[PDB]
Design a protein around this ligand. Structure first.
Ligand SMILES: OC[C@@H]1CCCN1c1ncnc2[nH]ccc12
Ligand SMILES: [Cl-]
Length: 167
């Protein structure tokens, strides 16, 4: 039993809700919130910009130190940093950016990072400002993640389409 509420169950381990991940994180304070990061951890917009703003820029300050020490992430890769006021930890995951020509096959590699955590609150990856089709992203998620994932879908129109086309 966990503190997530109002989710539709899609599979044994995948749950979905029309919600702003920032509001879900503040309410639930999960162990892990996933950020839809880029390789530079520059949290400018979309999920990342919204999460960072909710931390009063502390996420960005921490991220800049991470990059100065370690260099950029790989597309498909991740790092665990603080969740600040939103969660215990933030798993920053880089999905491929289709607008940059990055290989959509890397979306599966991106979702594999979720399997290192028993329960996560997450957005879809590679959709939003990253350019990919969210319907495809949901299928890759369901076919890749084996741990318990709670997906917050920002757009109501999209949520209804993801649900209706699922089975
Ligand atoms: O595929 C990611 C979707 C599409 C673009 C933004 N995004 C979000 N998902 C969930 N919670 C969110 N809060 C703020 C933005 C946001
Ligand atoms: Cl986004």
């Amino acid at each position: 039993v966990n503190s997530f509420s109002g989710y539709l169950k899609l599979t044994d381990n995948v749950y979905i809700k029309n919600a702003d991940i920032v509001e879900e994180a503040k309410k639930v304070k999960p162990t892990v919130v996933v950020n839809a990061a880029n390789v530079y951890l520059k949290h400018g917009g979309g999920v990342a910009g919204a999460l960072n703003k909710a931390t009063n820029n502390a996420m960005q300050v921490e991220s800049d130190d991470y990059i100065a020490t370690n260099g950029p992430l790989k597309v498909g890769g991740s790092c665990v940093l603080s969740g600040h006021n939103l969660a215990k930890h933030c798993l920053h995951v880089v999905g491929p950016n289709v607008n940059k020509g990055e290989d959509i096959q890397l979306l599966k590699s991106a979702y594999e990072n979720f399997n290192q955590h028993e329960v996560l609150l997450a957005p879809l990856l590679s959709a939003g400002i990253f350019g990919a089709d969210p319907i495809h992203s949901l299928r890759v998620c369901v076919d890749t993640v084996r741990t318990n994932v709670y997906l917050a879908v920002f757009d109501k129109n999209l949520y209804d389409k993801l649900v209706s086309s699922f089975l």
